[PDB]
Amino acid sequence: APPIMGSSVYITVELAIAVLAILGNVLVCWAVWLNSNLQNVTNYFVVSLAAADILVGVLAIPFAITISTGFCAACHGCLFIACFVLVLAQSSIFSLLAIAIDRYIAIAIPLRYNGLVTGTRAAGIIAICWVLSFAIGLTPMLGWNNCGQPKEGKAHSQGCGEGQVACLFEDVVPMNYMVYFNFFACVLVPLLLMLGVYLRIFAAARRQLADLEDNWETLNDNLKVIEKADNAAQVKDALTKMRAAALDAQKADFRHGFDILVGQIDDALKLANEGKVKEAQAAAEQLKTTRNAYIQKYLERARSTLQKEVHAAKSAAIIAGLFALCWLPLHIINCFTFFCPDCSHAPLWLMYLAIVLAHTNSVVNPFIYAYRIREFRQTFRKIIRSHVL
Numbered sequence: 001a002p003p004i005m006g007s008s009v010y011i012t013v014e015l016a017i018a019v020l021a022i023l024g025n026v027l028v029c030w031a032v033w034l035n036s037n038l039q040n041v042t043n044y045f046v047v048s049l050a051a052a053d054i055l056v057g058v059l060a061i062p063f064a065i066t067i068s069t070g071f072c073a074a075c076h077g078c079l080f081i082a083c084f085v086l087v088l089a090q091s092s093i094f095s096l097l098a099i100a101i102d103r104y105i106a107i108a109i110p111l112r113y114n115g116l117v118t119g120t121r122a123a124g125i126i127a128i129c130w131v132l133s134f135a136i137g138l139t140p141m142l143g144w145n146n147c148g149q150p151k152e153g154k155a156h157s158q159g160c161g162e163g164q165v166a167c168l169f170e171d172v173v174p175m176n177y178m179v180y181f182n183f184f185a186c187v188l189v190p191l192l193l194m195l196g197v198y199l200r201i202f203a204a205a206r207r208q209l210a211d212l213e214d215n216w217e218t219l220n221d222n223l224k225v226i227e228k229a230d231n232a233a234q235v236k237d238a239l240t241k242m243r244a245a246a247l248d249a250q251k252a253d254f255r256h257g258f259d260i261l262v263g264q265i266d267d268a269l270k271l272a273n274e275g276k277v278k279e280a281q282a283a284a285e286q287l288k289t290t291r292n293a294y295i296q297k298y299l300e301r302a303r304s305t306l307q308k309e310v311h312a313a314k315s316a317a318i319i320a321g322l323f324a325l326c327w328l329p330l331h332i333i334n335c336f337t338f339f340c341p342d343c344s345h346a347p348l349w350l351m352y353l354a355i356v357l358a359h360t361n362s363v364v365n366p367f368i369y370a371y372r373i374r375e376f377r378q379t380f381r382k383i384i385r386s387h388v389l
């Protein structure tokens, strides 16, 4: 078949992806700009990620279409066309890693979060990561390239000028760079890092949920103990273990609820020390009202916050996971090309599918926010509804 037919399918799909990438990610940026409830440090990395995905539609996909033709070009110009997408992919990895660390700090040291993680510091991190993304993605331009060993047969067969090559990705970008440097070091290692961070996030959330439940059962168990104890030392032992358990919970109207609880325990405790057991039990039984009134509400709000954080972190993890799914095939095909030179090159149609799937990643982020985060979903509706209506 004439190549122009298969290439017409490839180009049409690439342009379709470019349109979806631009529209969806413009909506993400628009949403964060308008809605103050979306303006947090976490979402500044989301916007940086959306900007990279817009750039895939506006620049990388047109570059990808161009380099598929093998057009004649100065090798360093070709290199820039071939490698710019690597800058955007690297920026996305830094943004994904930053989001994971952000959510980890939020769950592990909430008290210190807003003091550590600020808009000003985030903006600085985003600027540094973009600079590093240019350095990593355009490393071939610094001399790690095959511009020095041009394919002269292809150059003259295609009728290129001198100094010019048939501009093809695999002719100009070295496969050792793509496999060892780009894939293993700059992509795979950060992805495994994010896996580790997210693991630590879910473990932290699970431990804090358990601790909450433990304090609640420990406050309820020791109550029953006091109600059935026939000795003043039994009441004292239990009440001392409730005071500790209450003071851990305090740190972990609610602020008043705790002062009442500690006070009522201190009351029932001084009675117990004086031998007044029935009076200690009577004083201990008022804790039920403080528990019903205040403690049960603080337990349930704190449980609600942790669950919201587990949801947000799962949402972020899906986006990191989707990046991996969409990019691994292209990276794995490169590994086969590099490591198995006795293996037939992956056919053109599968190369096209791998490239298109990597580009498709720049579409998916907006759907995940829409499906998994109400605050974005609501703002999407309002930006669409107030432009339709």
Ligand SMILES: CC(C)CCC[C@@H](C)[C@H]1CC[C@H]2[C@@H]3CC=C4C[C@@H](O)CC[C@]4(C)[C@H]3CC[C@]12C
Pocket: 072, 073, 074, 076, 077, 078, 080, 081
């Ligand atoms: C839209 C704005 C922000 C940036 C767009 C600039 C892009 C389109 C420019 C910047 C550098 C340019 C390249 C620089 C040099 C060459 C070598 C020449 O033999 C063929 C064209 C080619 C490969 C150019 C293609 C277009 C190019 C990639």
Ligand SMILES: CC(C)CCC[C@@H](C)[C@H]1CC[C@H]2[C@@H]3CC=C4C[C@@H](O)CC[C@]4(C)[C@H]3CC[C@]12C
Pocket: 332, 335, 336, 337, 339, 340
């Ligand atoms: C989730 C992480 C661990 C995924 C990364 C695994 C990658 C690096 C693995 C998965 C399958 C592997 C390939 C399987 C088979 C072959 C054929 C052999 O002749 C050369 C190595 C080569 C080409 C391997 C290279 C590395 C490879 C691509």
Ligand SMILES: CC(C)CCC[C@@H](C)[C@H]1CC[C@H]2[C@@H]3CC=C4C[C@@H](O)CC[C@]4(C)[C@H]3CC[C@]12C
Pocket: 324, 325, 328, 329, 330, 332, 333, 336, 343, 344, 345, 346, 347, 350
């Ligand atoms: C879900 C993701 C992470 C896994 C996808 C793995 C894909 C990329 C794997 C599965 C089987 C693989 C193919 C198995 C055998 C060959 C023949 C060889 O001559 C060229 C590479 C080629 C054609 C491989 C290319 C990559 C391949 C298609």
Ligand SMILES: CCCCCCCC/C=C\CCCCCCCC(=O)O
Pocket: 058, 059, 062, 063, 066, 071, 072, 073
């Ligand atoms: C903000 C929009 C920016 C413009 C987007 C369009 C970019 C087009 C990309 C590459 C076109 C360059 C390839 C054409 C060179 C042909 C030279 C030749 O005839 O050998």
Ligand SMILES: Cn1c(=O)c2[nH]cnc2n(C)c1=O
Pocket: 064, 067, 082, 085, 169, 170, 178, 330, 331, 334, 355
């Ligand atoms: C990122 N990337 C690759 O890793 C690759 N491998 C072969 N062609 C490729 N192309 C066109 C590409 O854009």
